[PDB]
Amino acid sequence: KQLTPMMKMDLATLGPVIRWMILMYGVPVMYAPKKFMKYTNIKADVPG
Amino acid sequence: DPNEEPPTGSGNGETASQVELYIDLTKPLEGADFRRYESPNPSTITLP
Numbered sequence: 001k002q003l004t005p006m007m008k009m010d011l012a013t014l015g016p017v018i019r020w021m022i023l024m025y026g027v028p029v030m031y032a033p034k035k036f037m038k039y040t041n042i043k044a045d046v047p048g
Numbered sequence: 049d050p051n052e053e054p055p056t057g058s059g060n061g062e063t064a065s066q067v068e069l070y071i072d073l074t075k076p077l078e079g080a081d082f083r084r085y086e087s088p089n090p091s092t093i094t095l096p
Contacts, residue, residue: 005095 002026 003025011019030036084092 002094004089004091005093007091 001029 004023006022006024009021009023011021013019
């Protein structure tokens with residue numbers, strides 16, 4: 001759920017420097033917790 | 049006609065079907081999402 005997309009906001013000019021910030025608001029929500037699962041403690045020594 | 053079946057079931061005042069039809073008529077647009085029409089958010093398009 002997105003309150004606003006990834007946006008750019010301009011900041012104040014206190015001198016010969018240009019400033020701005022990038023912001024994003026949101027949260028992930030899953031409605032059915034029992035329709036997901038996970039595997040834990042998996043071993044895979046492919047790096048070496 | 050002595051052999052014609054007379055209609056019945058007229059003794060149940062405030063029938064459930066009548067209540068459902070009344071709800072459908074007197075309360076239209078129920079359960080619709082109108083939140084978008086009072087949003088002061090300039091961005092109305094959802095992007096990743």
